[PDB]
Design a protein around this nucleic acid. Structure first.
Length: 69
RNA sequence: GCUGCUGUUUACCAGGUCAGGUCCGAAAGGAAGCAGCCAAGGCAGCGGC
């Protein structure tokens, strides 16, 4: 379960925007996304790092909700 | 080395285009620009000089 699957699942348009600005490797192995890449992603989707963190955070609770079934 | 071809590889860090999204604007319209792609570079094989 990666950020691509999470993508298949108003504010939702801006969530796609963020993911739509990452590279394939990033969508597949989310943990490689540190500070520098977050900056690229945020500006790339006209967002704020915090928005990105908020998304990665959600995908996290989401991913964690998967590693339990 | 230079050059042609082929395979492969490369998040951002003054290449082109730019889905999505963003910014400015009452609007008409403008601006920047990630991913992708093209290009370019890296690692090599073969050929030409």
């Amino acid at each position: 379960f990666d950020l691509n699957d999470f993508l298949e699942q108003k504010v939702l348009v801006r969530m796609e925007a963020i993911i739509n600005s990452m590279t394939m490797k990033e969508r597949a192995k989310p943990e490689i996304i540190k500070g520098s890449r977050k900056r690229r992603i945020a500006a790339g989707s006209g967002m704020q790092v915090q928005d990105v963190n908020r998304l990665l955070k959600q995908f996290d609770d989401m991913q964690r909700m998967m590693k339990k079934m």
